[PDB]
Symmetry: C3
């Protein structure tokens, strides 16, 4: 279904019947990071199956509640392009958030670390991105522009809101884990193969710090409709640049590193949310 104003309105009005929470903040949990949703108080869990026109080991959830005093909606489980979903499908949930009242989107993901100074388990705040699929004609906004949401040619300047980035740094710092925190450029590989050593070396040389297969499409849709964005990568593996190495990325090890840092990351987001300006 086209992520136009009519269909987005439908989905949003349905949800608005199943809950009274008007979210100001939207959160999306990446691979292995579903715990950032567990401190949500007065929560209402709505499975994607109960929502008409949302998409689909079992189902994902839309979770409404409060976190550090603020109203949030959490997407437990995202939609990936490598899974075969259309642009309209990936766009819809973000545009639905927009109509629910979301002003700030906070997204996490798991990524490989390209930058040679990164360690396993480090956090990399995104300050910029390289959208390889978008450069190559698979940008999520290809097609008729939905004018009710935003402009035909969006600019991506300050896409990773620099005030949110500064606040995220300051909160890490004050809570004793500033040393895990970096800022860098995320490049998206459509996937689903991990990157070869040749591909990793090339991505590093283009100026990329972390690589993953998600996140950019959601961020583009969010900036398109004027939602502010904060995004962080968990370094769940170190990319291998050397073809003679036996070390390889493995999705279980990604989930495992996720599980080890999920609580620290959950705590981080909650503390950030507590310090967000309230108007």
């Amino acid at each position: 279904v086209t992520a136009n104003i009519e269909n987005v309105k439908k989905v949003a009005h349905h949800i608005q019947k199943l809950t009274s929470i008007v979210p100001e903040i939207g959160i999306i949990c990446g691979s292995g990071l579903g715990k950032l949703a567990d401190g949500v108080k007065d929560k209402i869990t709505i499975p994607y199956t109960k929502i008409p026109n949302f998409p689909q080991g079992h189902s994902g959830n839309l979770i409404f509640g409060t976190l550090s005093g603020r109203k949030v909606v959490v997407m437990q489980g995202r939609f990936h392009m490598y899974e075969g979903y259309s642009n309209d499908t990936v766009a819809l949930p973000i545009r639905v958030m927009k109509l629910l009242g979301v002003k700030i989107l906070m997204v996490s993901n798991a990524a490989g670390g390209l930058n040679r100074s990164l360690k396993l388990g480090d956090f990399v705040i995104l300050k910029d991105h390289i959208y390889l699929p978008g450069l190559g004609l698979n940008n999520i906004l290809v097609g008729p522009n939905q004018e009710a949401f935003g402009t035909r040619f969006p600019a991506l300047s300050n896409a990773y809101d620099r005030d949110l980035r500064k606040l995220a740094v300051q909160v890490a710092e004050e809570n004793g884990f500033g040393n895990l925190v970096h800022q860098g450029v995320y490049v998206m590989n459509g996937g689903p193969c991990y990157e070869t050593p040749a591909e990793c070396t090339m991505l590093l040389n283009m100026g990329c710090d972390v690589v993953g297969m998600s996140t950019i499409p959601e961020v583009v849709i969010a900036r398109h409709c004027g939602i502010q964005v904060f995004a962080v990568s968990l370094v769940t593996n170190i990319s291998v640049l050397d073809v003679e190495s036996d070390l390889k990325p493995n999705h279980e090890e990604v989930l495992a590193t996720g599980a080890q840092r999920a609580e620290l990351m959950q705590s981080w987001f909650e503390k950030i949310i507590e310090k967000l300006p309230k108007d």
Copy 2:
């Protein structure tokens, strides 16, 4: 949409040939804000895209839909006022049709303009950049306009893109700029295509600069590939309508309106430049 095969292209061309007697030798495509390169056409016939079967519609700002026939500096031209962009959702076949139609109408030379962001740090706002080469990012990544059964009536399966930007036309365009006092606005460089429609991020721009690109835009390469594929010679120029931002901490941003504005300020100079080039084209 309709396959850009010899049968369908013939239909469209024969229809147009009923609405006009002009046999074009030169085809012209106007980029964003550059519609005025068409206003000096004498003895003109304006045919809206709507009055042509199987042509598209165009819904972009700064692109009306007209096919304009007439003479320019003594030569017969057809002018696409308004082009078709991939970032709009159009198929390969839809973008390839108008250029293949030009081929059947008689076009030998194709002159294209477009608005672009300047990556090269020596470029100034309002500069002209003649394309001498391109980097077709969508084409490298399996979105080449020629993907699919080769239409043999038009060209070969594996076209070479050597001298795609005909070097004699580039030499002539430079000489004409020089003689008419605006040589200092003219550069030559490599155009890279971003599928779009997002403007490029600072990290994308930095990467594009480092790959050897001088200007970036979201058009043009597909049309050039179709034109070379069927043996049409090509001249192409970017207007620098903004300077790409390489620094993430900057507040400056690209804006469509400013692109249209810069286009408007230079459109007359560019029109004059094309007319002067066409006047010196060899004639048989």
Copy 3:
């Protein structure tokens, strides 16, 4: 086209298994101009793609050839399926997954490529030791879509994709047979095609670390590694990429076919000699 799922792949494989009794351990795919690597196949059964349900056309059909080579049972794809032709992911994936159900353990592939690396000569062989998948990075990876669990994992790693023991063997064989000087190893980058690369594109690909550029192969290799088939791949340098926009020299497919024809017999001999020394 038909989903390359376990049900459909099983159908195609069971049909083939009625037309022949050969259980292949080794699969071979011939690139542009290289169809002769299939002519030494003894006790051969030629099955045209037309006589297989749900296989494609590469029209004028090619052939699936079963037989023995240097003592081993092989299946040969004479003629491959190219993304620039408009085939779906499922169509390119199916033949390789069929091989997997037929018993293939090792896949040997050849292709024609442009030489980017400035030390390459026309007619050189470049063994692939790694590959840049430009379409794959750009959301046209052959595995995009529901993962077919019966064949492989959701997120395959491509470490040792170009099996290093097969590469070492191939080198030793070239060496012992007097043509070690034609053999290099490098990185292959895929251009979706079908336009040859511009000089600015070539210069960029060279600078990214690429040794050869072609419009095929990587998708098949991804499907093969995904289902645990081991891979050996070689490019014939059939032209020298032009980096200079002022040059009049250009790639043309006839010259590609011509170089292929000149080297096809040496390459066929190379493959047969490699297969002879495969562990049994």
